[PDB]
Each structure stands twice: as structure tokens, then as C-alpha cells.
């Protein structure tokens, strides 16, 4: 769709490499470590999808 079709997504980063035939349903925000992240944040705490 022209400027649409958002229903298809993929994870850019993860806490660790996914195991064979694994599947992570959760979409929790990755932790940055250098700063607390409970809400949205910057460098590493972006929405993984």
C-alpha cells in the first residue's frame, strides 16, 4: 500500500540472539543499561519493532 501496510513488522535488536525455531511474542522495550528505562527513551530503549 502506498505509504501504508504497517501490519508487517520485524525486530531490529534483541537482548540476545534468538534460538532456533524460537518465537518472542512480547514486545517489551529493550533496556539501555546506562539509564533507567520505564517509559520511552532514546538510544537503546526504542520500540524494538
Amino acid at each position, epitope marked *: 500500500k*502506498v*505509504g*501504508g501496510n*504497517y*501490519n*508487517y*513488522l520485524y525486530r531490529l535488536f534483541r537482548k540476545s540472539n534468538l534460538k532456533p525455531f524460537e518465537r518472542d511474542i512480547s*514486545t517489551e522495550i529493550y533496556q539501555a543499561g546506562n539509564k533507567p528505562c520505564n517509559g520511552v527513551a532514546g538510544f537503546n530503549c526504542y520500540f524494538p519493532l
Partner: antibody
Amino acid sequence: QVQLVQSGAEVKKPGSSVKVSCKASGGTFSSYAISWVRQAPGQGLEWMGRIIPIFGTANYAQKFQGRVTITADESTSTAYMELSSLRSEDTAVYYCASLASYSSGWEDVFDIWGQGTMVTVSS
Amino acid sequence: DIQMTQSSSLSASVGDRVTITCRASQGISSWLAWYQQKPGKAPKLLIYDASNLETGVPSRFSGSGSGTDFTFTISSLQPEDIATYYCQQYDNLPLTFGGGTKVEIKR
């Protein structure tokens, strides 16, 4: 569980700007996507635009760009809608609904709807 | 641009079968939905995939068709069917809805 609530009715002069919004209650602002759709008296539903609060992507209909502007935030968790240089024909009720096409292989349908915001224009 | 036309007003008694279609100029890739709505109220989604019903709506409501055609159907009318129904296209970004077919309980 997700549910939406809209603002109250409004009345203003032609040629002015009208501001209306809807609360992104239930679920989370990150796992939610909002889209505004117009329904005029004597007409079916009609699209105004879409906004994904977490992605920040927005678009409009080919006949309401500029005339209509869309914005959203997380501090308030709501989609902001502003219609400028509104005509007298802009007297209609605006809806704010959930955009399902945002995640997990769903499609561009509206599973949850708000109540409705009636905007009337008269002298 | 893509558009549609529902075909506008109906009247039926409890128990009979009714069918409605929303034609279009170009083949919609089965990306069509149908809503229930009282005139001037928040609609309720019934059909989102051409052959899959949403949670909460009974099997009494149904639909069929694919491509450049579709047909919404109620296997049997009931007094709760006093409302209008809207055919919606979502094949592309410029979302558009139908004019809305209205079926009235027939006395």
C-alpha cells in the same frame, strides 16, 4: 482490553480552526494506533487521516491535506486533530477509532470506536 | 481513484434471508469489511475478513465474495437488525466507505 473516549461537542465560526482529540485509554500508547474518520449528515463514513503515536507516521486524505492536521503524544496519550479554514459544510461528527493494521498481521479495520465529536458551524 | 457503490434501502421481516453487495471499479484483494451502525452512531465491526467473523457477533451474520465483488448476507433477520450497514474498502491508503445500506424491520 481497550476502550476510547472522545471530547465533547463544539461550535465555532466558519473560516476558523477547530481542535478535537481522543484519549488513547486502555492497553498502552505504544501498542495503540489512532485514525480519524468523518461522517457528515446525509453521508457515510469518510477518512480524515491516521497517526501511529509510537512510530510517528501520519497521512491524510487526498482532499483534506492542509485543511486537516493530525498530531499525537504520549505524555497525554491522545491523538490531536485540528481542522483549519473550516467551511460551513464542515458541520459533521468526527470519530476516533483504533487502527488495527498497526501490528501482528491484522488489517486496516477499526475494532474499537469512540463515542463521537459533533462539530457544527453556523452564524 | 478506487470507489464503491452499495446496492440503498431494504425492508425485511424476521426470518427471511437478505443479501447486499458493494461493487467497485478495480479488484479489491479481499480487503473489505462491513460494519453495523445505527444512523449517526459509532459503528460496530462485524466482518473484517471476507470469510472470518469477529469475536462477539453471532453466526447469523455472514458474507461472501472475492476480488472485484462481495456480498454481505444475514441468514435470518431479527428485530435487532434495525440499523444501517457500511461496506468498507481497505486495499490502499486512501480509505473510503460505502454509502450505507439500511434494512428496516418489515411490518
